[model samples]
Target chain A: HMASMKKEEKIAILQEIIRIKSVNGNEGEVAAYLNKLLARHDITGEIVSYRDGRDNLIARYQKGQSGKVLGLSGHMDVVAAGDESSWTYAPFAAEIHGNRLYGRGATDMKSGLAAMVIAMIELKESGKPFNGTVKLLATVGEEVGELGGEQLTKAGYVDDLDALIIGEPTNYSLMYTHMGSINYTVTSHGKEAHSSMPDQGYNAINHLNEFITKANAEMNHLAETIENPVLGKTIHNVTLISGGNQVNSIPSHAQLQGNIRSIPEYPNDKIIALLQSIVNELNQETDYHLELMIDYNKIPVKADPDSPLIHSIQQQFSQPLPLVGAAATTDAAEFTKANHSFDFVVFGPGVVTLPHQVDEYVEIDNYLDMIEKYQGIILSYLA
Target chain B: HMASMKKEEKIAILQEIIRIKSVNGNEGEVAAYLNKLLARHDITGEIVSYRDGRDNLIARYQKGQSGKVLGLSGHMDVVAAGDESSWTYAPFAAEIHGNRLYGRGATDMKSGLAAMVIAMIELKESGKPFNGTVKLLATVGEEVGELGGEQLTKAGYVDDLDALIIGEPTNYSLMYTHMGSINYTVTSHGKEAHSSMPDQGYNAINHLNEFITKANAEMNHLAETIENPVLGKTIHNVTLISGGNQVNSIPSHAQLQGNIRSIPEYPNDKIIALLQSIVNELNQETDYHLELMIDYNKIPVKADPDSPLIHSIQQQFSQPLPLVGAAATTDAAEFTKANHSFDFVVFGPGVVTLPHQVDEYVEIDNYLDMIEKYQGIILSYLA
Candidate 1:
């Protein structure tokens, strides 16, 4: 059983998963491997296929249904290796250089994932009389859209979870809450005319500028009015803009993408309504035919900063780590849709800056340490 | 011999010149044809070649050096036909349908050039009592960058002119002044970061929006402060803009082109300085690194609305047409660089709307009528 898995054996498991090469869409291989690995430990694991070659693996160790259910989660896929020649070690080689495991997904979450799977197996073999189920939700397509997470949530897999841990390479800082992400495009329609006679045509850039100014003011006002105790202020900015074909002609079409990081207080729907209201007001008052489109939206997931789950995870660590809110999002956003009442925290190993970067690696110490920390959380929560 | 030429003979001359097909860069053929035509009427016309196959024709009729000089100006090169299949009659064919002569340069000054040449010949044939020089300043490359006008001016072709008449399709409505055109691009440089962490980077689009707002306000201030008597107000507008590639990243570089229709009081230099001042002030006050580049600059040319030349041209019209200023720039912009003190008027034959269009044509009546008007202006101005 994985209960006696040494540091080297756990590192081997991580390297095996890294070598699987589940780059986003091609994730069935990693899901099937994880299912077989769970079965070898006398645990029941199911491979759920969402598409032709995309799969999610759900493994469970249940003692009884009467106690609180604890969920351990991680993603199976990683972003592309991106010009593999730039790396000192091959992306999928999972080369152990000195005390580090070098690979594309080494620090992104594969190390955290392998550690969580081993932690679940270790807990099952320890036979400490834990009551509730311990489920390991290994998902695909977390790098792209949260496809596997959405599919699992829709199938009621997250409905029974009393507490959830997302091993999303936070370097074990214990991220208890994260802001929702909202991306929107605002387009202004105007009439085209020669730039010489600007009065004959409406300029889309001018109207778009007006929108930027007004929206900026509104965002500042919202930051002042609705404050999140943990996140402080909601972030909003105009990130990209483009308009017109020729410099000699008045721009007839222009658009800007606004990126807003939403807190639980001023959530995704509220931020979307704010933009829609601005666009509506502008359309009514000006000659511009403005439109608003929501490109991406994710709900903010939060757990009480003083929750018992957060205290239990903090105690397991040798050094006390602050429970912070993450600006970056995760599949927990989709899982929250199924059960918002569960205690959620993103806690795992791997460098926070190493994801999607060249020469990505995880320190062997951090990876092995998280395995013990995750086992402690499972025993304390499920007992 | 040409003085008593009927309308059919004059129309034939226009048709012959139009058939030469002087599309911009290939102006030598039209210049050579005009040179021969002027020589046939016992007038000496010089073919001035600025570049290979790019020539200008200068025909002069001198009475005495002391008398007031009158220069008749028109360009030889024409813009392209553009999608020849879209034309009802083939471009460069000089097809005559109804009372109109159809060709690429039919309305946009070939008819005007033909009338000016025949007018110069008629004066010589009649043995009229006049003084000083009557020079027909036929030019090349007027449709593109006004290369021919720049060359002619550099060669001292416009310095001695007491009065100059530009035949640039005004439909007999005397255009006494026209705005200078100033095209400029403003680029803003800022550091790029993830949109979620906007404080880490400067958003170029945000700075550009600030520039637009301030520039727009300054333009309005200029319009309110400096009013051109003929042109009413100097027009300025943001015609085009683009910035950033990804919606989730803060834009590092954003640029916009500002098109300004400048008048005499607010010329090209003045407007350019205004933009430079705004950019300088913004760089001083904000984190924006803005740079200004003048893409195109043309000086404004103005003549007295109540000048003798304006009155004489008005008298030639059967109905008194209001003397006005045009928003469009011309070779007059370049010509003024040589002699800014001359009485300049853009008076010619064709419909103003027909230029750079498919099936471009000039009415036969307008072409023949402008010839008589040119002769009358020459006699009265010289007398």
Candidate 2:
């Protein structure tokens, strides 16, 4: 039904999806909407529930005789549209002005998912002899933790797929490798007493100051030592810190939260171990209790350059796509953990800068170009 | 009339002075009362007004012969009785139970002033011939900032006196030297910004922490390098620190108030210069301003060992007294600045620990013993 329709019809379907505010854990309504849309195209799919009201939907287009399966993964959920008043157009209005489609999830992955659904519909109607199956998995909870991707993988839903394409926003450029991210919350404990009697109290805020100084110094030293040709070196960013109550009282507890992004080849464990050693040294002098808790840890993922799927997708693109490293986390790490040998590459329409921002919009011309390119990649890989 | 009366009449006169509440700056009614009492003794004295309503009563018991004119300097003002509820008996009552005289300023110079007044009355009443003229200067503001001492000294009151005996609760001990105190407030400025963007802002608290760390380390080093036989090197106490508004915002300004105690032999100027140099080094790394404001700076004072006044006071004590240094500031420093030959000491009935504490009281036996010893010193010095 959607295959022979105009590009406007495909955009209408995508805008309807974006109109539903499917933020993180509230992906149930959007998942149901997508399932109904897929059923109209004779596509069979399942709605899997996760924690809270979040749901993941998976649909497969069987080519009569299935051989090598390819998985097309996209997230249904999007980050919350922060400060809706800051935008000229309402975040969920799906307003199209000029060449740009304005919405919260317009550029992120909703556009990529719409392109894939249209490409699959066209493939089924072409009466082409396909040697493989194409699967579309719309996931929830990608904004917070990759719980939806994890659940789907753990349930053996995408186990048989030989290759996968994570439709993450990359400006239609293939991203084969990305840096890993480690988020940590470091806490230092000390004795609290009256400021009048500083001799009687051990200040935790002071201890935290010392730790932050050491951590920054160590991070700088690590940046100089750990050099990578493709992904560069590891970068550390201190996100947040909170401690103490008043100037006249010693702080009992101090906490700092930060993130470290490291190249795939560099083991994150060594860096974490080094951080612990520094804390140990500080404890020797101050007798302060120091703790480092990892809030999120994700390993890097890279696709083999010599893979047939990679070569097929590379030929479909206009330019020679460089192997770029993303400074962010994605659901591809979940697929890697499941031991699925997928030559995954992140490619989509719209600039990567526009996601998760006020007035988030995608260009209409870029969206149409990405759909055409996505269809060519699918057809070439099947051939 | 008191000269013709017995010692019981003199004791009653002294007790009456103690009953009047002349606490520190609020010593107006008591000074007026003292003027009336001195008029009855046939001693004409001037009531000089200082800051506030507090007045100094300078009563002269002139012997008429002028050989080496001596001035008996004593302050009428007393420290406030902190909490009436905390006291076992009423603080302003001057309740004498057994040999004990219970009052806030009973041992803190009011009793000393009473003894000096009685001694002057006896010296005047005695038929013995005197070699030098005697003058009793009852001053005000001694407990606070020595405004009375500074005012009288500037007015040429005690300029030409050969010697001055300041009855400042010195428990009849011959104290020749006192360590002068210097109070300073050091302020450090830093760039202020949101705490989330700490990297963009210069944290004043961090600069303060750096300054404190270096200062403390240097102090340790100084302690190791310098040694004094009498004053035993310099001492420092950080009394107050005011800095930063909230935990989540970088502080733009920080101020620290502290006192430094140094002997005459120690190079205090050099120490101050070194602190400024350290601050300059800190300023190089931070975009901050620093200011050091000195509110109180007093040079150390030492008395000549061969002075007859020092010798006469030592004769009353058991041993040749050792010269000691005081950790706190006193009104004697003001007299020294006026270019007056003043012999001062800080010897009280109780230990230094009892002065500014809750439930502070002087020992009964110690108070009586100090009175007798002070009486003997006054007679010997004036004779």
Candidate 3:
């Protein structure tokens, strides 16, 4: 078995893993590679393909003991490498230049993923008798719909976990609670005619404009009414809109999408109800016919910031990194649906701004530091 | 020279022209056919090509001596025959069913165009002692851009005319004036970012929406302030809009088009000034960067309802068809630029509602009646 690979060997393993082109749906190749890596280290993992060319890997480390189940998770897939010619180095090459490794998922984070796998392998090689479990959940489609997380959660993968850590880019900080994200669309229906004769038909864009005007003010007021202790306020915005086919004709239909980053105090359902009420009142009071549809609704995840799990993990780091909340949602939101009574943490080696950018990279020192940090957290928590 | 043509001969001529399929750009064939018809009756006309497959025809009948000049005008090209399968008969067939001549341009208005050609022929054949010139101005691209009219007006075609009559679908009524048509676009430029963080980027759609709200109110107030005696109030509306490539990202650009049917009392310039002022105020007072673009602008043209030529033409009809203004525009708007001193009239045989419909048609009786009406208008005006 491979025992305590050298710093050069570990960097080689990460570079080899990053060489796989796992942009979104093509995570099956990454899964197969990781599975082969785990098999070499005497660990059995299952590769599950919910869709073709999109795969998720799940591996557990337990030595006949019933103790706290710890989950280390990261998505196998990365966002698209836009305008590849704009990058200084090729995205999938994982080339290291001046103490920084560059690739599409280097920071966002194939680095965190590779480091977690190494920690699991190092734990087995250390020959420590810790009465606990560490589960590896490498997933697909997390950059878009969180398909792997949703599927794993539905299949009872996170049902037994007492502590879950997501390897999303967090710059080594701990993100315990973040706002939930809800995307909804409102469509207004009207009659179509030549624009010269407004009396003959209704304008759908005008109707949608009315709804945006009213809902925008109401949502702004709602954002100001209350603030969650950790996540602050819900961020509500009308992001997109489209309507009308011809410049000289009245539109028969128009639609607008609203994105709300919500909190526990102002839940998704409450926001939905408020928007629905606005639509309902508008439909009844005016000549406007409006319909609301929920597209994506992810609940906000919260964990105790001062718990023993936090103390155990904080003790491993040299500096006491602040336990904060994010405006961005993570896979922890999906895992919370499986079991909410657990410690949720979002920690990684990558910078937050470098995730979906050109020449995305991770600092060599941070990657090396996180590997030891993950190993120490697993050992100390189960000691 | 041919003295007269029977009803069957005229109907056959219309069917032959319709069979040529002169849909907008392919107007050269229509012009060629009309020129042949004029040549057979000992009259000479010229076919001028502005672009390939697009032609305009000009023919003048003057029997020595100089007097008041009259122009008989109609576009040679027809609107597109949309969804040929949706038609009761094939759109280009020019079929006759129940005393109706059915085709794409039957009502709007190959019938009027052919009737004008026939009137010109009959006037030449009569050998009457008329001293004025009757100039025929058949055009192309009137259904879309009025491109033919613009070209003809600029070429000194209408400069000699003391009277100009448009053969648009008028149901035997006299349309002495109409509102001008103005098409404009307002674009909003904003910084692009994810919708989650509204502070980082300005939403172009939101900026456009604000412009729409403000402009809509101001335009409505302007519409209420002035009402023209002949053309009534100016009709203003925001007809079409689009913004943002994605639903979750803040739009970098958004644009909306406004169609204003303006009157001389509230001229195109006055309306454009108001919209430009709104844009100016918005750009000055807010973070919004908006640009205004005028796409298509045609001025309103009017003639005295009780003019001497109107009295001469009104005496020919037995029913005394109401002399009124129209909500629609015509080629006369272009002709007015050439000779604003001429008396303008929109008189035709087709029904007002049959222009661009699926099963467009004109009554056989109306077609024959307009030929005699055109003859009387010319002979009386020249007497």
Highest-lDDT candidate: 1
Give the alpha carbon lDDT tens digit for every residue of A192-311 in model 1.
Answer: 888777787998988888889889989999888887887778988888898986787898999888788889888788788888888888888666688899988888888877777787
- Record all residue pairs in model 1 with backbone atoms less than 3 Å apart, i.e. clashing: none
For candidate 1, the per-residue lDDT at A356 reads 85
Quantify all predictions' global Cα lDDT against the true fold: 0.86, 0.70, 0.85
Interface RMSD of each: 1.0, 6.9, 1.4
Query: What is the number of backbone collisions in each predicted candidate, taken in the order shown?
Result: 0, 2, 0
What is the TM-score of each predicted model, taking all chains together?
0.93, 0.66, 0.93
lDDT of 3 by residue, B279-313 (tens): 88888766769999999988898888887678878
Per-residue lDDT tens digits of candidate 1, residues B1-383? 44487778899999988888888777888888888888888898888888999998898897744688888999988888889999999998999999999999999899999999999988778888777788888888987678889999999989888888999999958898998888889998988888766787888888888889999999999999998888878888898898986788888999999789998887787788889998888898666688899888888888777777677677766788868888888898888888457887999999888887899999999999888889888888887
Where does candidate 2 chain A have its weakest 10-residue lDDT segment? A192-201
Tens digits of per-residue lDDT, candidate 2, B122-213, equal 55666456566667777887766677877887887777677666665544354556666666667877776644234566656556656656
Worst lDDT 10-window in candidate 1 chain B: B1-10
Which of 2 and 3 is ahead in DockQ? 3
Clashing pairs in 3: none
Chain A TM-score of candidate 1 vs. true chain A: 0.92
